[PDB]
Protein backbone atom coordinates (compact mmCIF):
# COMPACT_ATOMS: atom_id res chain seq x y z
CA UNK A 1 0.00 0.00 0.00
CA UNK A 2 2.09 2.95 1.36
CA UNK A 3 4.98 2.18 -0.99
CA UNK A 4 2.78 2.09 -4.03
CA UNK A 5 1.23 5.23 -2.61
CA UNK A 6 4.74 6.62 -2.87
CA UNK A 7 5.11 4.86 -6.21
CA UNK A 8 2.00 6.47 -7.69
CA UNK A 9 2.96 9.80 -6.11
CA UNK A 10 6.19 9.69 -8.19
CA UNK A 11 4.64 8.52 -11.45
CA UNK A 12 2.26 11.44 -11.46
CA UNK A 13 5.05 13.94 -10.82
CA UNK A 14 7.11 12.45 -13.72
CA UNK A 15 4.05 12.68 -16.00
CA UNK A 16 3.20 16.12 -14.60
CA UNK A 17 6.73 17.19 -15.51
CA UNK A 18 6.32 15.54 -18.95
CA UNK A 19 3.00 17.21 -19.84
CA UNK A 20 3.28 20.70 -18.27
CA UNK A 21 6.14 22.87 -19.69
CA UNK A 22 5.56 25.80 -17.27
CA UNK A 23 5.75 24.55 -13.64
CA UNK A 24 5.07 26.38 -10.34
CA UNK A 25 8.78 25.95 -9.65
CA UNK A 26 9.62 28.01 -12.72
CA UNK A 27 6.75 30.39 -12.11
CA UNK A 28 7.75 30.96 -8.54
CA UNK A 29 11.46 31.28 -9.46
CA UNK A 30 10.62 34.08 -11.92
CA UNK A 31 8.01 35.76 -9.68
CA UNK A 32 10.54 36.24 -6.85
CA UNK A 33 13.46 37.34 -9.05
CA UNK A 34 15.73 34.29 -8.85
CA UNK A 35 16.22 34.16 -12.54
CA UNK A 36 17.21 37.78 -13.20
CA UNK A 37 18.18 35.97 -16.44
CA UNK A 38 14.42 35.83 -17.27
CA UNK A 39 13.21 39.33 -16.09
CA UNK A 40 9.63 39.92 -17.36
CA UNK A 41 8.06 42.79 -19.27
CA UNK A 42 5.52 44.67 -17.14
CA UNK A 43 2.13 45.52 -18.64
CA UNK A 44 0.42 48.06 -16.43
CA UNK A 45 -1.68 50.12 -18.88
CA UNK A 46 -2.89 50.52 -22.50
CA UNK A 47 0.47 52.15 -23.09
CA UNK A 48 2.69 49.23 -21.88
CA UNK A 49 0.19 46.79 -23.42
CA UNK A 50 1.29 48.28 -26.78
CA UNK A 51 4.99 47.86 -26.12
CA UNK A 52 4.63 44.38 -24.64
CA UNK A 53 2.20 43.46 -27.43
CA UNK A 54 5.31 43.28 -29.63
CA UNK A 55 6.67 40.21 -27.75
CA UNK A 56 -0.07 32.10 -32.59
CA UNK A 57 -2.89 34.65 -33.00
CA UNK A 58 -1.93 35.27 -36.75
CA UNK A 59 -2.98 37.98 -39.29
CA UNK A 60 -6.05 36.80 -37.50
CA UNK A 61 -4.72 40.01 -35.81
CA UNK A 62 -6.52 43.23 -36.79
CA UNK A 63 -5.54 45.81 -34.17
CA UNK A 64 -9.06 45.79 -32.69
CA UNK A 65 -9.69 46.82 -29.09
CA UNK A 66 -7.57 45.76 -26.10
CA UNK A 67 -10.16 43.19 -24.94
CA UNK A 68 -10.23 41.24 -28.24
CA UNK A 69 -6.45 40.88 -28.31
CA UNK A 70 -6.65 39.57 -24.71
CA UNK A 71 -9.51 37.28 -25.72
CA UNK A 72 -7.27 35.71 -28.36
CA UNK A 73 -4.25 34.95 -26.18
CA UNK A 74 -6.52 33.48 -23.54
CA UNK A 75 -8.13 31.36 -26.21
CA UNK A 76 -4.91 30.12 -27.62
CA UNK A 77 -3.47 29.46 -24.21
CA UNK A 78 -6.64 27.61 -23.13
CA UNK A 79 -6.33 25.33 -26.17
CA UNK A 80 -2.77 24.40 -25.16
CA UNK A 81 -3.76 23.74 -21.54
CA UNK A 82 -6.62 21.52 -22.59
CA UNK A 83 -4.03 19.46 -24.56
CA UNK A 84 -1.49 19.26 -21.75
CA UNK A 85 -4.09 18.36 -19.15
CA UNK A 86 -5.51 15.69 -21.43
CA UNK A 87 -2.08 14.22 -22.06
CA UNK A 88 -1.51 14.34 -18.28
CA UNK A 89 -4.87 12.71 -17.73
CA UNK A 90 -4.04 9.92 -20.18
CA UNK A 91 -1.31 8.99 -17.73
CA UNK A 92 -3.31 8.55 -14.49
CA UNK A 93 -3.19 4.78 -13.68
CA UNK A 94 -6.46 3.27 -14.96
CA UNK A 95 -7.65 6.45 -16.70
CA UNK A 96 -7.47 4.85 -20.17
CA UNK A 97 -9.18 1.67 -19.12
CA UNK A 98 -12.45 3.62 -18.61
CA UNK A 99 -15.33 3.95 -21.11
CA UNK A 100 -14.46 6.59 -23.72
CA UNK A 101 -17.58 8.71 -23.07
CA UNK A 102 -16.61 8.99 -19.41
CA UNK A 103 -13.06 9.88 -20.18
CA UNK A 104 -14.51 12.67 -22.30
CA UNK A 105 -16.95 13.61 -19.52
CA UNK A 106 -14.18 13.99 -16.92
CA UNK A 107 -12.25 16.26 -19.23
CA UNK A 108 -15.33 18.28 -20.15
CA UNK A 109 -15.79 19.14 -16.46
CA UNK A 110 -12.30 18.80 -15.03
CA UNK A 111 -10.55 21.04 -17.49
CA UNK A 112 -11.39 24.53 -16.31
CA UNK A 113 -10.89 23.73 -12.62
CA UNK A 114 -7.36 22.76 -13.44
CA UNK A 115 -6.81 25.73 -15.72
CA UNK A 116 -7.71 27.97 -12.74
CA UNK A 117 -5.61 25.92 -10.24
CA UNK A 118 -2.64 26.37 -12.50
CA UNK A 119 -3.41 30.04 -12.99
CA UNK A 120 -2.88 30.53 -9.24
CA UNK A 121 0.72 29.39 -9.73
CA UNK A 122 1.20 32.39 -12.00
CA UNK A 123 -0.32 34.93 -9.68
CA UNK A 124 0.47 36.93 -6.63
CA UNK A 125 -1.18 39.93 -4.93
CA UNK A 126 -0.37 42.40 -7.75
CA UNK A 127 -0.62 40.53 -11.08
CA UNK A 128 -0.06 37.57 -13.35
CA UNK A 129 2.83 35.93 -15.20
CA UNK A 130 1.90 35.64 -18.87
CA UNK A 131 3.55 34.68 -22.16
CA UNK A 132 5.36 31.69 -20.64
CA UNK A 133 6.62 33.99 -17.90
CA UNK A 134 8.30 36.51 -20.27
CA UNK A 135 5.46 38.86 -19.26
CA UNK A 136 3.67 40.07 -16.15
CA UNK A 137 0.19 41.69 -16.31
CA UNK A 138 -0.96 43.80 -13.35
CA UNK A 139 -4.12 43.18 -11.40
CA UNK A 140 -4.79 46.93 -11.59
CA UNK A 141 -4.65 46.90 -15.41
CA UNK A 142 -7.01 43.91 -15.61
CA UNK A 143 -9.39 46.08 -13.55
CA UNK A 144 -9.39 48.89 -16.08
CA UNK A 145 -10.84 46.52 -18.68
CA UNK A 146 -14.36 47.64 -19.55
CA UNK A 147 -17.69 45.90 -19.87
CA UNK A 148 -18.02 42.36 -18.41
CA UNK A 149 -14.27 41.95 -17.98
CA UNK A 150 -12.86 44.51 -15.45
CA UNK A 151 -14.08 42.60 -12.35
CA UNK A 152 -13.81 39.09 -13.68
CA UNK A 153 -10.38 38.12 -12.36
CA UNK A 154 -10.79 39.84 -8.97
CA UNK A 155 -12.31 36.74 -7.33
CA UNK A 156 -9.49 34.63 -8.96
CA UNK A 157 -6.75 36.83 -7.45
CA UNK A 158 -8.49 36.45 -4.13
CA UNK A 159 -8.17 32.70 -3.92
CA UNK A 160 -4.90 32.74 -5.87
CA UNK A 161 -3.65 34.56 -2.84
CA UNK A 162 -5.54 32.20 -0.49
CA UNK A 163 -4.41 29.05 -2.32
CA UNK A 164 -0.78 30.16 -2.68
CA UNK A 165 -0.69 30.65 1.10
CA UNK A 166 -0.77 26.81 1.20
CA UNK A 167 2.76 26.74 -0.27
CA UNK A 168 1.90 23.71 -2.46
CA UNK A 169 4.64 22.44 -4.78
CA UNK A 170 4.70 20.78 -8.21
CA UNK A 171 4.74 17.32 -6.62
CA UNK A 172 1.78 18.28 -4.40
CA UNK A 173 -0.10 19.82 -7.27
CA UNK A 174 0.28 16.71 -9.44
CA UNK A 175 -1.92 14.58 -7.23
CA UNK A 176 -4.39 17.29 -6.44
CA UNK A 177 -4.84 17.67 -10.17
CA UNK A 178 -5.45 13.94 -10.64
CA UNK A 179 -7.91 13.88 -7.72
CA UNK A 180 -9.94 16.63 -9.42
CA UNK A 181 -10.03 14.80 -12.79
CA UNK A 182 -11.03 11.48 -11.25
CA UNK A 183 -14.23 12.82 -9.68
CA UNK A 184 -17.31 10.58 -9.99
CA UNK A 185 -19.96 13.25 -9.42
CA UNK A 186 -19.75 14.81 -12.89
CA UNK A 187 -23.09 15.09 -14.68
CA UNK A 188 -23.59 12.33 -17.25
CA UNK A 189 -21.04 9.76 -16.08
CA UNK A 190 -21.93 6.22 -17.12
CA UNK A 191 -19.80 4.20 -14.66
CA UNK A 192 -19.26 6.12 -11.45
CA UNK A 193 -17.93 3.23 -9.38
CA UNK A 194 -14.52 2.56 -11.14
CA UNK A 195 -13.66 6.27 -11.04
CA UNK A 196 -14.35 6.39 -7.29
CA UNK A 197 -12.00 3.46 -6.61
CA UNK A 198 -9.43 5.39 -8.67
CA UNK A 199 -10.07 8.71 -6.80
CA UNK A 200 -9.89 7.00 -3.40
CA UNK A 201 -6.38 5.69 -4.20
CA UNK A 202 -5.36 9.21 -5.29
CA UNK A 203 -6.97 10.86 -2.23
CA UNK A 204 -4.77 8.58 -0.12
CA UNK A 205 -1.56 9.11 -2.09
CA UNK A 206 -2.17 12.89 -1.62
CA UNK A 207 -2.93 12.53 2.10
CA UNK A 208 0.49 10.90 2.50
CA UNK A 209 2.24 13.33 0.17
CA UNK A 210 1.07 16.19 2.33
CA UNK A 211 2.00 14.66 5.62
CA UNK A 212 5.41 13.80 4.10
CA UNK A 213 6.20 16.93 2.08
CA UNK A 214 4.78 19.34 4.74
CA UNK A 215 4.91 17.82 8.19
CA UNK A 216 4.05 21.10 9.92
CA UNK A 217 0.80 22.09 8.17
CA UNK A 218 -1.09 19.64 10.36
CA UNK A 219 -4.39 19.91 8.51
CA UNK A 220 -3.21 20.71 4.95
CA UNK A 221 -5.23 17.87 3.45
CA UNK A 222 -8.54 19.31 4.78
CA UNK A 223 -7.66 22.86 3.73
CA UNK A 224 -6.85 21.59 0.25
CA UNK A 225 -10.05 19.51 -0.06
CA UNK A 226 -12.15 22.69 0.43
CA UNK A 227 -10.41 24.53 -2.45
CA UNK A 228 -11.88 21.91 -4.79
CA UNK A 229 -15.31 23.34 -4.19
CA UNK A 230 -14.18 27.00 -4.34
CA UNK A 231 -12.91 25.83 -7.72
CA UNK A 232 -16.43 24.95 -8.91
CA UNK A 233 -17.66 28.43 -7.93
CA UNK A 234 -14.74 29.89 -9.88
CA UNK A 235 -15.94 27.73 -12.79
CA UNK A 236 -19.65 28.50 -12.77
CA UNK A 237 -18.42 32.14 -12.69
CA UNK A 238 -16.38 31.39 -15.78
CA UNK A 239 -19.29 29.68 -17.50
CA UNK A 240 -21.53 32.69 -16.75
CA UNK A 241 -19.08 35.06 -18.53
CA UNK A 242 -18.97 32.99 -21.72
CA UNK A 243 -22.75 33.33 -21.46
CA UNK A 244 -22.68 37.16 -21.66
CA UNK A 245 -20.18 37.02 -24.59
CA UNK A 246 -22.36 34.45 -26.27
CA UNK A 247 -25.21 36.99 -26.62
CA UNK A 248 -23.74 40.49 -26.28
CA UNK A 249 -20.15 40.82 -27.55
CA UNK A 250 -20.39 40.08 -31.22
CA UNK A 251 -17.11 39.06 -32.81
CA UNK A 252 -15.86 36.68 -30.08
CA UNK A 253 -16.07 33.15 -31.57
CA UNK A 254 -14.97 30.44 -29.22
CA UNK A 255 -12.39 27.96 -30.47
CA UNK A 256 -14.15 24.75 -31.50
CA UNK A 257 -12.24 22.78 -28.86
CA UNK A 258 -13.56 25.27 -26.30
CA UNK A 259 -16.98 25.05 -27.96
CA UNK A 260 -17.12 21.26 -27.46
CA UNK A 261 -16.37 21.92 -23.79
CA UNK A 262 -18.67 24.86 -23.07
CA UNK A 263 -21.81 23.18 -24.46
CA UNK A 264 -24.37 21.45 -22.23
CA UNK A 265 -23.12 22.11 -18.66
Amino acid sequence: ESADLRALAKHLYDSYIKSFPLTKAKARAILTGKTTDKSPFVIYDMNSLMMGEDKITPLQEQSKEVAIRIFQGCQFRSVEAVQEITEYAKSIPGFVNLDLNDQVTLLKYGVHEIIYTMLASLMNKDGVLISEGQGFMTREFLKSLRKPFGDFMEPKFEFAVKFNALELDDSDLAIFIAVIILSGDRPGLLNVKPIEDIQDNLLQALELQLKLNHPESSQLFAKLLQKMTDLRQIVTEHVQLLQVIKKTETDMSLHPLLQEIYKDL
Binding site: V82, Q83, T86, E87, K90, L100, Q103, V104, L107, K108, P256, L257, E260, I261
Partner: peptide
Protein backbone atom coordinates in the same frame (compact mmCIF):
# COMPACT_ATOMS: atom_id res chain seq x y z
CA UNK B 1 -18.50 13.67 -29.15
CA UNK B 2 -17.07 15.96 -28.73
CA UNK B 3 -14.98 15.35 -31.82
CA UNK B 4 -11.64 17.03 -30.90
CA UNK B 5 -11.42 15.42 -27.46
CA UNK B 6 -11.50 11.85 -28.68
CA UNK B 7 -8.84 12.43 -31.24
CA UNK B 8 -6.78 13.86 -28.39
CA UNK B 9 -7.91 10.82 -26.42
CA UNK B 10 -7.31 8.26 -29.18
CA UNK B 11 -3.68 9.48 -29.26
Amino acid sequence: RHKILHRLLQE
